[PDB]
Design an enzyme around this catalytic site. Structure first.
Site, PDB file in Angstrom:
ATOM      1  N   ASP A 127       0.791  -1.223   0.000  1.00 42.29           N
ATOM      2  CA  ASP A 127       0.000   0.000   0.000  1.00 42.29           C
ATOM      3  C   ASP A 127       0.832   1.285   0.000  1.00 42.29           C
ATOM      4  OD1 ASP A 127      -2.384   1.260  -0.197  1.00 42.29           O
ATOM      5  OD2 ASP A 127      -2.886   1.131   1.949  1.00 42.29           O
ATOM      6  N   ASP A 154      -6.738  -9.517   4.550  1.00 43.52           N
ATOM      7  CA  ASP A 154      -7.891 -10.266   4.067  1.00 43.52           C
ATOM      8  C   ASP A 154      -9.213  -9.690   4.558  1.00 43.52           C
ATOM      9  OD1 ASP A 154      -9.175 -12.545   2.750  1.00 43.52           O
ATOM     10  OD2 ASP A 154      -9.633 -13.238   4.794  1.00 43.52           O
TER      11      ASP A 154
END
Ligand SMILES: CNS(=O)(=O)Nc1nccc(Cc2c(C)c3ccc(Oc4ncccn4)cc3oc2=O)c1F
Ligand SMILES: Nc1ncnc2c1ncn2[C@@H]1O[C@H](COP(=O)(O)OP(=O)(O)NP(=O)(O)O)[C@@H](O)[C@H]1O
Ligand SMILES: [Cl-]
Ligand SMILES: [Cl-]
Ligand SMILES: [Cl-]
Ligand SMILES: [Cl-]
Ligand SMILES: [Cl-]
Ligand SMILES: [Mg+2]
Length: 278
Positions: A127, A154
């Site tokens: 990210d 997740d």
């Protein structure tokens, strides 16, 4: 460090996507506290916490510090080093666009932090983008919010949320994640901070899915034609090659002209920062 919600006290708010600047009373520390809300089984929750504990073993001048993570009132709390400069995303607001010599330093900072994470912990960031690059008044540039917990990743399902995406073409076509993917994001972030606006598409808003489709189908963005040195241009371009095989790697970027120059330049970053941010 053993933290619990009673220890803390809010000083102010730093932003959201939420994060408070808090005083950790028993120790005197000023920390940044991220709260993550998740409607999840207690069992996986404890696994996230268990997995975040790895952050205690991060020690890099290019990586934001970690104090501890705990659960309370349906919130995962991640407690961090407070970066009084905020994110380059915030800085970009106040500044309109960031000068390429500053972006040279940022690039070196990012490249170093990625390489530290990948080598000492074999983890990818997943990210990289302006809001996850934080700066402070000592002039430091540090990465934050990397994918340390596979369960947290997740649970958040981040790929489909938010208005901008820095995902790579390979990944959006079913490839495994690798370092080359963080390179694309950095290049994408550099262009965003250089020109002052998220580069996709080139200049009705695209919702996430048209955006993602655009990324896999259209040619990559690039820097405009006169404003920037050719070395910067080429650097960003090597970051945004759609074929990951062709795209540059950390070693290659680290010896690129743009970086060798930037590393040599005397930039007073803390100075620029404080007369841009306040
Ligand atoms: C958009 N990318 S994605 O792979 O789809 N989703 C995710 N990507 C990255 C990461 C995550 C999950 C995640 C987050 C959000 C996080 C935030 C703060 C933190 O604390 C911290 N402290 C000091 C220094 C650096 N971090 C540790 C963190 O660990 C994580 O695994 C994704 F969910
Ligand atoms: N350790 C920190 N010190 C100072 N400011 C911080 C810190 N961590 C986060 N922030 C600020 O808090 C804001 C929100 O952080 P965050 O919750 O990760 O959303 P975001 O990364 O900005 N966007 P998104 O990833 O889509 O949720 C950011 O704009 C940061 O500038
Ligand atoms: Cl949820
Ligand atoms: Cl967004
Ligand atoms: Cl890899
Ligand atoms: Cl040039
Ligand atoms: Cl400096
Ligand atoms: Mg963030």
């Amino acid at each position: 460090m053993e933290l619990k919600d009673d220890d803390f006290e809010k000083i102010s708010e730093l932003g959201a996507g939420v994060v408070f600047k808090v005083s950790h009373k028993p120790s005197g520390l000023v920390m940044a506290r991220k709260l993550i809300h998740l409607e999840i089984k207690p069992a996986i929750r404890n696994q996230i916490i268990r997995e975040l504990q790895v952050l205690h073993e991060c020690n890099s001048p290019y990586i934001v510090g970690f104090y501890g993570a705990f659960y309370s009132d349906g919130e995962i709390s991640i407690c961090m080093e407070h970066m009084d400069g905020g994110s380059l995303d915030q800085v970009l607001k106040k500044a309109g666009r960031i000068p390429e010599q500053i972006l040279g330093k940022v690039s070196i900072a990012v490249i170093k932090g990625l390489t530290y994470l990948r080598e000492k912990h074999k983890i990818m960031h997943r990210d990289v983008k302006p809001s996850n690059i934080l700066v402070n008044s000592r002039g430091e540039i540090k990465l934050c919010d990397f994918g340390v917990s596979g369960q947290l990743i997740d649970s958040m399902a981040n790929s489909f949320v938010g208005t901008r995406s820095y995902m790579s073409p390979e990944r959006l076509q079913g490839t495994h994640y690798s370092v080359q993917s963080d390179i694309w994001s950095m290049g994408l972030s550099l262009v965003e901070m250089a020109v002052g606006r998220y580069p996709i598409p080139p200049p009705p808003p695209m919702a996430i899915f048209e955006l993602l489709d655009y990324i896999v189908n259209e040619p990559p963005p690039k820097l405009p034609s006169g404003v920037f040195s050719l070395e910067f241009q080429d650097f960003v371009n090597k970051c945004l090659i759609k074929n990951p095989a062709e795209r540059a790697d950390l070693k290659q970027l680290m010896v690129h002209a743009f970086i060798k120059r930037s590393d040599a330049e005397e930039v007073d970053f803390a100075g620029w920062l404080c007369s841009t941010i306040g």
